[PDB]
Amino acid sequence: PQGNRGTVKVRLDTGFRAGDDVLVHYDPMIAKLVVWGDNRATALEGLRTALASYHIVGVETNIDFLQCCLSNPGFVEGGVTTRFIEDNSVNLLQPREIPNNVLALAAVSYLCSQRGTSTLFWPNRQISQGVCFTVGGNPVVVRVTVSTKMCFTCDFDSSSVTVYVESTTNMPDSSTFIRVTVDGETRFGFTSFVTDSEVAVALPQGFYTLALQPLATDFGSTSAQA
């Protein structure tokens, strides 16, 4: 959200719109986001909030790196040396953890994207589905059993997550707003964007993008001999 907010002023300057393709080795900068407050701490908090709300799907970015830099104690202390990036490389390049709730919600969102108006019904059975993501190069697989009441159960190692989808709404920006009840006691709404390669969820916890397991390029390859 750009403009004059409650306590800070946010200004975003970009040369790209939704649907544009950024070509490598030509102007790598996606955008510049400036936040003005009354004190440095307030400006940093506003920048953190604005970066948390900047949702980009399709191109890898350094939003997590910027969040790590902003939350670094050395940066928040005051002025830092030029080699600061080289000084806290291990700390700033820390991997971002993905809880099982995010995996379950992403799988449910992907399945809802697959579903049109058809009813999930198998007599005397729960419909079985599977969604494969890549987490750190690891091919994680989420097995989901879905009932006719639009209630998904996703299975992880010694873990089960129950997600009841109350309603869905297709936003004009090719995205979907989904109201869910996680387990039986956590009701909230979120926004999901499903491509052919990744699933993005804007949860109250933040913004996550999970890459689907890439398809093989030699699927059904019969080169006359082996």
Binding site: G130, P139, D196, Q213, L215, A216, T217, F219, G220
Partner: peptide
């Protein structure tokens, strides 16, 4: 690790990975 995808994923795939797409680039040189 075996049989992870669904055939509809290959049916709706980019031109690089869609298996029923003919790939005959021109040898312009």
């Amino acid at each position: 690790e075996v049989y992870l995808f669904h055939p509809a994923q290959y049916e709706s795939a980019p031109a690089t990975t869609r298996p029923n797409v003919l790939h005959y680039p021109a040898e312009s040189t």
